[PDB]
Amino acid sequence: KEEWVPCTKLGRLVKEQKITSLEEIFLFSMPIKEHQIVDQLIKESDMRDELMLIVPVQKATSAGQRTRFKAFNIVGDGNGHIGVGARVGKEVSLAIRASMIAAKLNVVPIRRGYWGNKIGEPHTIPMKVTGKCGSVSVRLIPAPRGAGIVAAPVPKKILEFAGVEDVYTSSCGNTRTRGNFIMATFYALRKTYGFLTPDLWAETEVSRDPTDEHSDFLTMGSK
Amino acid sequence: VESGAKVLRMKEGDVQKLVAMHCHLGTKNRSNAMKKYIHSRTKEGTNIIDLHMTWEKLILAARVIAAVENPQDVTVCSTRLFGQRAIFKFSQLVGTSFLAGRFIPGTFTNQIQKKFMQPRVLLVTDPRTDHQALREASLVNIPVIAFCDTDAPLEFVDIAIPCNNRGRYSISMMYWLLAREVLRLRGTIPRSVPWDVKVDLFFYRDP
Amino acid sequence: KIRTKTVKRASKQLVEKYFSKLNKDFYQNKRVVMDVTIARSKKLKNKIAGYTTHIMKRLARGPVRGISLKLQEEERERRMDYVPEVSHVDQAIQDGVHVDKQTFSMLKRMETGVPRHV
Amino acid sequence: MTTKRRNHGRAKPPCSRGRTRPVHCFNCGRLAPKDKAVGRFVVRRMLDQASARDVAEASNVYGAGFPMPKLYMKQRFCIACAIHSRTVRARPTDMRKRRFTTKV
Amino acid sequence: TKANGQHAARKLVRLRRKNRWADKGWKKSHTFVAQKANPFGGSSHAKGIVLEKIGVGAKQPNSAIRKCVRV
Amino acid sequence: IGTYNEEGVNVDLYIPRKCHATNNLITSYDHSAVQIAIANVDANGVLNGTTTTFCIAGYLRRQAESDHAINHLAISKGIIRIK
Amino acid sequence: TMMSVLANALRCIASAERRGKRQVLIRPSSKVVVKFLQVMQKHGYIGEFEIIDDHRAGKIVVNLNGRLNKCGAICPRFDCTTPDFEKWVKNILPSRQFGFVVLTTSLGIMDHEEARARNTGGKVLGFFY
RNA sequence: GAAGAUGAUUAGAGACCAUUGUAGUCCACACUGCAAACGAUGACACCCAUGAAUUGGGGACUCAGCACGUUAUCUGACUUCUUCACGCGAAAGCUUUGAGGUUACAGUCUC
């Protein structure tokens, strides 16, 4: 792109070789405020960007009416990183460009476990999870190997992104409003790490934030 | 702490100051979450804060600002005149950043703004009306330390120092004690002497 | 009637950077405005001139909404350096402190105990 | 349908009474429950200030001699009644929830 | 709601048997008034003798004439 | 620690942090889950350097249970004195 | 009244766990409630517990380490069997890996895992994650 | 005061309004059981946080070892936070006083 100037601590570190992966940023909870943080760390040839929806919205005005376009982006790596944008712009290309920014901010990692057969690398979600936006709520159920992605084409996409290849699913409520279904499905795949399991606990040690360690070089950064 | 020689413990003259300038008291109203801090109630109806409790809170917050090796990342904030003065004198010594007068929204979250900053830590004079600050500390992963009136809520306050924020002489004492002890642990002013400059410098005066 | 924010902005900046302008006379302040400024309107220059007068006339009271560099001096007008003074007086040299009986009870059960003059 | 008012425009709480006596209006003669009805207290003068002077002149045992009495009454109004003489008015959401208790 | 007891069975059964009569997708199967009503007897097709050709109108949003047959 | 294979090899992207107070997994999603680092002190007021660490969850600043838990954590490690 | 002792106990535990509280009180006590707790304390989900004696009915008190996520009760005590372990373990639990259903048997009170091992089914009791 | 009568109002008007007036409005003994009979929230039971009050009981000469009030505590009722915590809900809203503890779906019964 055009030449870039970080206004973020993280941004500086990422432009240097200090933070070299998403993991570091995630592990000590910090918000991503610049999409350029994603592009630098995760190289292109792993990232994919699809537009799940583009639709007109209308706002009422006396006589003629102004119009706009909502759209969704979806983004991520098949290595277990996903992130869903949605944004609004008064023209087509506007809302498109805007979506992809927001999407790369909202990126979250994915835990994949097993069904109770352990071979290779994860093919299955570690547990049942649910996510809800509007009246729709999705129930992701873990499936045995070779099941394939058993869901509708709308979530099939969203699951392919997140590296889940074996699942069984069902939805509830009004599912024929597209937008609500997307957000729902995504909140599901978050909830994995949000749930405490015996395998994880051992009172795993914490250490200093990248920010703190690199404080000196951020001071120098400011200059 | 330990191992240690009873270091950074309350003393004769320390107590003598606090009682005198009336920061040992709280606000009159009963707490909404700070019930534990209160020690009894007077026959004036004003809730006294326990001294030992307050003291340990202060030492704690010293350990926090001691653990920032680039003090400018810590912020101080007042929205009250009585703390205004004491901020400026503190930001000289300890070297902290500050905003005083009034908090401005989006100094910790809005990218397009030249008053933008990303703190490591945040302080406040009153969590009640500095509240905008706290709610933008929440979403940036910034811990908080506040000077809590007994009445005051503790929402989005991680660590809390019970305090009286009514009148000049109350608030000045607290900043003075922090600043003192902080500089005793960094740049090693000894606790052998009484500290170099006075609490009268931290009193609001009007110009 | 009411003046625009262009006027008030420019005039505030002027009164900060210059104390050559100090007058309540329209005429003097006009001639020093116009030569120092490029604004290319008679209206704006006359406005700005009259605003600078209005500033100074209000400063005779004290409070203004204007901007001056006078703040420099007003800040170091604060001299709070006195030899103890309020510090050790409050701690009581023999000046005395008296306080509630609940406060007393708290103190004497502390590890420190009561300090003198309480 | 929608619960516009929690107390339903009443000073009657749920699950207590479910019946409070009707009371006439001093305007139109309409009946409504006492709790719904809109109370005010008047304190109506028996003389204007302008006339008070003139009468207190001719008085010796009254006016100056004793302070003038006033007609006191309670006025219970209907809803419609109140609104039309604009002594109760519509308010925004934040304000509608406010009460001033029984004090003026 | 429902009853979770061990011997609760008969109440459940009788509840269903009542509430299926509020379904029209039950009636349409089990009830023979529906069968009777249908002009084929519920058969796939039937034959008839043409009586008269009857021109039939159409509803308001789409104005047309439609060709129909009284059989 | 973490998910393993039958070959014993870790499959996880990361192992999330512990909130010591509730022993619950701090998510990346929670940005109110702050890591408070206090610097220890020895005799003669010399800082040992930052050694100890606390981690607080973002579910403890939605009702301000934060302060309470920090005390029980601290007091147990002898950092905060009680009489 | 209460028609299941278990239901009264394990709705105090679940609620308390969702609030992160580190101890809970339990109003009644039974021989049964004991055994249930015992299981989970072995597998590491509970610190300790005390039974206190009022000499009418006891009051259990438990120390939560926050390692639980739910403790349920399967109220009708439906019959599960050697094949039908599979069925339950899928349907009511989020996993087969760390889902624990607890059952009653003539033998005693035990996990499904141990039930299969000794090859006796029985009537179900409760479950936890 | 339904019905009725008369006068207005109106293009038309027992209309809404005004003056009247029967049944009825009251009581006793019989029927009727038809209401927005509403909290549009079935009943019993458990868990669940913030603040300030009110209503009863309890606790620390002559209807009189009394009565009231204040501080603090408790049990039982009605409700407010117009700073009600978690959570739930499509939203409005609901919050120990549930529509909360529910797709992680099972306390009990019934309509």
Distance D94 CA to H95 C1' (A): 20
The verdict on G4 and G62 lying in the same domain is: yes
How far apart (Å, rounded) are the C-alpha atoms in residues A62 and D25?
45
Compare all CA atoms of chain A with the CA of G68 and give the residue at the minimum distance.
A196
In chain A, what residues touch G67 (CB-CB under 8 Å)?
Answer: 196, 198, 201
CA angle C87, C90, C94 (to 5 degrees): 115
* Cβ G52 to strand H below 7 Å: no
Residue G82: which domain range? 69-129
Residue D15 CB contacts under 8 Å (≥ 6 apart), including other chains = none
What are the angstrom distances between the C-alpha of G89 and each of A95, A129, D11, G42, G92? 46, 16, 55, 20, 6
Q: Please give, one letter per residue, the 3-state secondary structure of chain B.
A: CCCCCCCCCCCHHHHHHHHHCCCCECCCCCCCCCCCCEECCCCCCCCEECHHHHHHHHHHHHHHHCCCCCHHHEEEECCCHHHHHHHHHHHHHCCCEEECCCCCCCCCCCCCCCCCCCCCEECCCCCCCCHHHHHCCCCCCCCEEEEECCCCCCCCCCEEEECCCCCHHHHHHHHHHHHHHHHHHCCCCCCCCCCCCCHHHHCCCCC
Report the Cα E70 to chain-centroid distance in Å. 23
Residue B151 CB contacts under 8 Å (≥ 6 apart), including other chains = B26, B27, B29, B30, B31, B32
B166 touches chain C (CB under 8 A): no
Query: What CATH number is given for A110-203 in this structure?
Result: 3.30.230.10
Phi-psi region of C86 (alpha: psi -120 to 50; beta: other; left: phi over 0): alpha
At A50, list the tokens: 């699809």
Nearest CB neighbour to G65, from listed F23, F59, F65: F23
Compare all CA atoms of chain G with the CA of E3 and give the residue at the minimum distance.
G76
Cβ atoms within 10 A of the Cβ of A190, count?
Answer: 18
The verdict on G8 and G39 lying in the same domain is: yes
How far apart (Å, rounded) are the C-alpha atoms in residues B112 and B134?
20
One-character DSSP codes across E1-55: -----TTTHHHHHHHHHHHGGG-HHHHHHH-SHHHHHSTTTT-S-------EEEE
How far apart (Å, rounded) are the C-alpha atoms in residues B153 and B176?
24
The verdict on G97 and G46 lying in the same domain is: no
How many domains does chain G fold into?
Answer: 2
Cβ–Cβ under 8 Å, residues G47 and G118: no
B120 touches chain A (CB under 8 A): yes
Nearest nucleotide by C1' position to the G17 CA atom? H101
Report the Cα A156 to chain-centroid distance in Å. 15
The verdict on G57 and G77 lying in the same domain is: no
CATH code (residue D55): 3.30.1740.20
Residue G60 CB contacts under 8 Å (≥ 6 apart), including other chains = G9, G25, G26, G29, G33, G34, G37, G49, G50, G51, G52
CA proximity to F22, closest of D82, D23, G19, C35? G19
Instruction: Tell me which nucleotides of strand H come within 7 A of a protein CB.
Output: 38-42, 44-48, 50-52, 78-83, 85-87, 89-90, 92-94, 99-111
At D80, list the tokens: 């419609």
How far apart (Å, rounded) are the C-alpha atoms in residues B89 and B205?
13
The verdict on G64 and G76 lying in the same domain is: no
CA atoms within 13 A on the CB side of G15: 9
B-proximal residues of C, 16-75, CB under 8 Å: 74-75
Q: How was this structure determined?
A: cryo-EM
Cβ–Cβ under 8 Å, residues A32 and A105: yes
The verdict on G46 and G18 lying in the same domain is: yes
CA proximity to G123, closest of G79, G72, G76? G79
CATH number for A1-109 (one of 3.90.920.10, 1.20.58.410, 3.40.50.300, 3.30.160.20): it is: 3.30.160.20
Judge F/A contact: 3 or more CB pairs < 8 A.
yes
**Per-residue b or e along A127-148, where b marks 16 or more CB atoms closer than 10 Å to that residue's CB:** bbbebebeebbbebbbbeeeee
* Cβ G11 to strand H below 7 Å: yes
CATH code (residue B144): 3.40.50.10490
G93 three-class SS: coil
Compare all CA atoms of chain G with the CA of E8 and give the residue at the minimum distance.
G76
Residue D44: which domain range? 1-104
Cβ atoms within 10 A of the Cβ of F42, count?
Answer: 14
How many domains does chain D fold into?
Answer: 1
Reported resolution, Å: 4.0
Domains along chain F with CATH numbers: 1-83 (3.30.1230.20)
How many domains does chain B fold into?
Answer: 1
Question: Which among B159, B181, B183, B184 is the top mutation candidate for probing chain F, defined by the most F β-carbons within 10 Å of its own β-carbon?
Answer: B159
Token look-up 């070959």 returns F7
Q: Please report, as a single letter, which amino acid is at residue D17.
A: R
Q: Where in chain A is the domain with CATH 3.30.230.10?
A: 110-203
How far apart (Å, rounded) are the C-alpha atoms in residues G76 and G123?
9
DSSP letter at D29 equals: -
Nearest CB neighbour to A193, from listed F4, F16, F55: F16
Q: Where in chain A is the domain with CATH 3.30.160.20?
A: 1-109
CATH number for C1-60 (one of 1.10.60.20, 3.40.50.920, 1.10.260.40, 3.30.450.20): it is: 1.10.60.20
CA proximity to C15, closest of C65, C66, C59? C66
Nearest CB neighbour to F6, from listed A28, A118, A207: A118
On the question of a cis peptide bond just before residue A170, with omega within 30 degrees of 0, the verdict is no
